[model samples]
Target: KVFGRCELAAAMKRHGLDNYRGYSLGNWVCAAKFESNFNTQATNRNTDGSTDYGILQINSRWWCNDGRTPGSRNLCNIPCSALLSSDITASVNCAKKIVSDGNGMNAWVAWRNRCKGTDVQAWIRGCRL
Candidate 1:
């Protein structure tokens, strides 16, 4: 679950993310740190203790499992075990799909900023991100 630099880089690349040195990856990493501490096994339900699971904090028994991820539809009933499998791409891609709105980067950036507390560019020199 504690993805090393190489693993994080691979996940970024798999998502078609360029410029690992750019603010994007920095932001992504910051977001990952806040969201799941880069733990692919991260999971937390809502205050009501609903069905949320996996790293990237995937909510299952619903958005991911119950008719969300189709095609063999492994998502519907799956317990998000693939997130911990050898293929991290599956989890990264699933997270992307959930947030991207099929258009662009998702809540990762926003969430990162919420915790990161400043613009990535602004902190670049100080934090050396």
Candidate 2:
């Protein structure tokens, strides 16, 4: 699902992502904005020929499978398409798993290159959740 900024924040909070794995809600929101603009159907091909999928843009190389992709770790053990749905439960769960593995938000280039060291709080500014 495509969500307004505030709507995405509220949903993330509801899912307990406001402080998930030591990352603040603002960081999460900011990364999501840069990653997929809160669109669940978002996908992008990386330079390594891997694809990023969903609101969090989970990578197919280490997180999920895109069917045609070979040598996927499938660490999340889910189909990549599962992340491209309006229901963000699976994506959120997978994100948690990814963060737990030591990369944190660094797992996403958007978070590292854009949300990092910036005024991320603005991303959640009127979400009120």
Candidate 3:
């Protein structure tokens, strides 16, 4: 498990996510919390027969391949298991690509529902960023 939210924020900052893709650091932090509670190994099955992977809960439909699904878009071009790693480099890069694809954090349901228009400063409170 991650040490804490601050550590994840610090790591994201070190990975150049302080204000990435025009989104604030707090938004990313808050989204991660709601998506996976900072747990890198988190996974969830959606009602549409798809699965969400990793801290950001990327979907199997368009992001990563879990082997069970056929014809996956796999935009990240990495196995879904890769996202479950505690080292978030691959996951972060995939997240960057997802946002860069013009969806922004809207690709993440937790971001749109739980983070949007919410006061997420506490996610980064006292953080160096």
Candidate 4:
């Protein structure tokens, strides 16, 4: 499912992503904007043969096991396909693990490159929390 910016942000906040590990809701919003454009079915296969799934474009190498990536840790302990569903709870849930494990939102390059030092509040400007 594709979502509007506020819609995705609201859903993420509901999933308890606000201030998660010090990354604000707007920070996540900024990353999601570039990562998958808020589309749940988004997927990207890395040069290393690992795949990224869902809105956050989570990697198969360290997060999910797609039966493709070699040495996949499956830290989420779930099938990578689970991230492609319309219900975003799984994506948010796995993202939490990713952030906690990394101890920062730097796990997703999109976040560091785009959302890290910017006015992320612009991503949530008119959105109702």
- For all predicted structures, in order, the TM-scores are 0.59, 0.95, 0.93, 0.96
The pairs that clash in candidate 1 are 65-75, 65-76
Q: Following a full C-alpha superposition, what root-mean-square deviation does model 3 have from the true structure?
A: 1.2
Report lDDT per candidate: 0.53, 0.89, 0.87, 0.90
lDDT of each residue in 106-127, candidate 2, tens digit only: 9888899999999898888877
The sequence of per-residue lDDT tens digits that candidate 3 reaches over residues 11-111 is 88888777797888899899999999999999999877789988888889888989877766888899999999989998899999998997788888889
- The regions of model 2 sitting more than 4 angstroms off are none
After superposition, the stretches of candidate 4 with alpha carbons farther than 4 Å from their true spots are: none
How do the residues 1-129 of candidate 4 rate in per-residue lDDT, one tens digit apiece? 999999988999999999998888999999998999889999998899999999999999998889988777898888999999999888899999989874588888999888899999899889989
Query: Which has the greatest TM-score?
Result: 4
lDDT of 1 by residue, 1-129 (tens): 577654665566557644432335555655565667667777665554444445456665444553333332333334566665545666666765555554243444446456455564322233322
Q: Which stretches of candidate 3 lie over 4 Å from their true place?
A: none
Clashes (candidate 2): 0
Pairs that clash in candidate 3:
none
lDDT of 4 at 85: 94
Instruction: Give me the runs in candidate 1 sitting further than 4 Å from their true place.
Output: 19-23, 66-79, 102-129
